[PDB]
Structures are given as C-alpha cells and as structure tokens.
C-alpha cells in the first residue's frame, strides 16, 4: 500500500463482451485470442500480424448506402482496435502504423468505385511493410555484420525480433565463427524459440536463465545485443522485463552493449521511471496441486508481473537503426528528420 503500484490502473482484467452493432470481423477476434491467452509475439511480429488481418478486413468493405468509404472505415476499423485494447494495449509499432493508416482513410475522395479501393490501398500498405520493415531490416544486416568479428560471442535477451535474422546471416550466410548466449525468464520463455531456431540453424548456442547471469559474464564474453519495444525521447529503452539487469552488469563489466532497433520503433513520448507507464498481464501465470494458490481471497498477498521496463541510456553504448548507428543520447533528432519526414 505504501507504493500502491497495485493501484496503478494501467490495465484491468475485463472481458465478456456481447455487442453486435458493429459487424465484428471474426478473424480479428482470433488475433486477440492468439495474444491474450498465450502471448506469441514480439513487437514487429504484432506489426506484421496487425497488418495481416488489416489486409483481409479491408477486403470485406461492406460500405453502407448513405456513407462515403472515407466516413465509415474511420469508425469501422477503429472500433475493432478496442477489441485489441481489451486484450493488450498498443505499442508504437502498433501506433505509428495506424495513424499513418488513418491518413490514408482521409486522403481519399468520393471517386472510388470500390474495385479501385483494393490496389490503391493494398500495394501501398504492402509497400509500407516492404519498406518500413523488410528492407529496413536489410540495412540492419550489413551494418551489424561489419561491427562483428569472427570467433566472438553474442549475448541476447528474450526472443529477438530482428537480430535473429542478423545471427542467421553471420553464422550461415557469412559462416564466420560465433557463439550465442540466449537468456530469457520466467514466465514468458520466448527465448527458447530462438534457442530452437539457431541450433536448428546449427550454431553454438548456450541457453541461460537470468538468475544464473553472473557466470556467463565470468567467461569470454562481449557484444551484448538487445531486442527492443520502444525508445524514449531521452534515450531510455522501453523493452521486455529483465533487460536492464544485464544492461547494467555488462556495462559495469566494461564490455559494450548495443540495441538493435529501427526508426519505426521511436516515439514522441518521454519518461524516466520504470514503474510509471507499463502493463500487467494476468497474475495467475507465476504459479506453474500447485505450491500456492489464492493470491485472491487471502489476506496480504499479491502477484505482480512486470512486462516492460526502462533502461538508462548510459548503459547503452551504441544504438543501431536502418539508417546507421548513433549514440543513445542522439535519439530524438531523427524524430524531426525522418519519422514523418522520410
């Protein structure tokens, strides 16, 4: 009660809707069903999957009689976003795409016979993720590869989002020697997906848990690379929980730390505290007859499960985007030069 972070109302556990005024897309319920019951995403996997259902749901237009297609879809698509907000609040990978999409709703005129409404939207929103994601990730590949020598180590955290493809390129598409250290944490064992993949790729993978983190650093170790969820306007890395403890330690143990990221994952907002702006996710998950049951109904017990947390930018040495590399204090200068400009 003294910190009262349990009464930080960033999320509730509300469910069970029945309303049928909107024609709810059945497949967008599947997307929310695939998130909230068991999380299967990073952030750019959402930015793919949020776009996967959007190409389908615009194809079923269902434009009514006395309404322009500019007038209904700004309500029709945005009503379906609140289904996701019941499941999981948005990211900036969510956020920067959808406001760009709401521009495209507004910049059309009453001239389209709804047959032309596909290809002016379909390839355009396809060339979004073709440019802003795919070949944006291509420029990640050449930039990080020249900053990695052979016969070294990489320490990652959680499931990566883009540097999985980077580790595939340096182990197979360039065949230089490399050892991989993947560490994830209870409850979301998403780093095991990388641990399956890179040894299916056939490379030296050492799996790890965050409680045993010191003895990884007591060996020959360097080049700590990180996934990301958003970068603050200061330089704080808003990312998956438990990122900063290796980010403080490897910076304390004088070997450099980088964050693989992109310009789409920037943001205008700013903060400097970990427990201010976050999300909780269903406190039943940290249980597994069990050992304890009854965080409810029992006096003086609670289960927290932090999803996102900030890292100080002094821990990060170099921030790499698709345009290049940059020091972490110099993050917000792209916000005036490329994001909404490029």
């Amino acid at each position: 009660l003294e910190q009262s972070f349990d009464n930080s109302s960033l999320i509730s556990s509300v469910k069970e809707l029945l309303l049928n005024k909107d024609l709810i897309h059945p497949s967008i319920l599947l997307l929310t069903s695939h998130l909230a019951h068991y999380k299967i995403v990073g952030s750019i996997p959402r930015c793919i999957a949020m776009l996967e259902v959007f190409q389908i749901v615009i194809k079923d237009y269902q434009t009514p009689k006395g309404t322009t297609l500019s007038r209904n879809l700004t309500s029709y698509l945005s009503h379906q976003i609140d289904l996701l907000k019941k499941a999981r609040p948005l990211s900036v990978t969510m956020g920067n795409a959808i406001r760009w999409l709401k521009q495209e709703i507004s910049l059309i005129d009453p001239s389209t016979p709804d047959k032309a409404a596909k290809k002016d939207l379909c390839e355009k929103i396809g060339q979004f993720a073709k440019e802003k994601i795919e070949l944006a990730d291509q420029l990640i590949i050449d930039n990080a590869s020249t900053q990695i020598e052979e016969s070294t180590t990489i320490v990652t955290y959680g499931s990566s989002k883009v540097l999985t493809e980077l580790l595939l390129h340096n182990a197979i598409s360039l065949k230089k020697n490399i050892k991989v250290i993947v560490v994830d944490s209870r409850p979301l064992f998403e780093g095991r997906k990388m641990a399956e993949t890179l040894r299916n790729a056939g490379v030296n993978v050492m799996y790890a848990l965050i409680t045993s983190l010191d003895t990884i650093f007591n060996m020959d170790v360097d080049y700590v690379f990180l996934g990301a969820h958003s970068i603050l306007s200061n330089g704080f890395l808003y990312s998956r929980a438990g990122t900063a403890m290796l980010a403080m330690s490897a910076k304390r143990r004088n070997i450099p730390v980088l964050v693989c990221c992109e310009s789409l994952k920037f943001s205008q907002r700013v903060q400097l505290d970990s427990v201010t702006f976050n999300e909780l996710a269903d406190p039943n998950d940290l249980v597994n007859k069990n050992i304890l049951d009854g965080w409810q109904e029992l006096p003086s017990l609670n289960i927290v499960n932090i999803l996102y947390d900030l890292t100080p930018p002094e821990y990060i040495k170099k921030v790499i985007t698709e345009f290049g590399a940059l020091p972490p204090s110099s993050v917000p200068v792209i916000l005036r030069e490329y994001k909404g400009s490029a």
Partner: peptide, 10 residues
C-alpha cells in the same frame, strides 16, 4: 516536452 540535459542546443 521533457528533454535530455545534452539536447538543449537543438
């Protein structure tokens, strides 16, 4: 907005 101590030039 809120800003870095080193961003003050821009």
């Amino acid at each position: 907005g809120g800003f870095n101590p080193s961003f003050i030039y821009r």
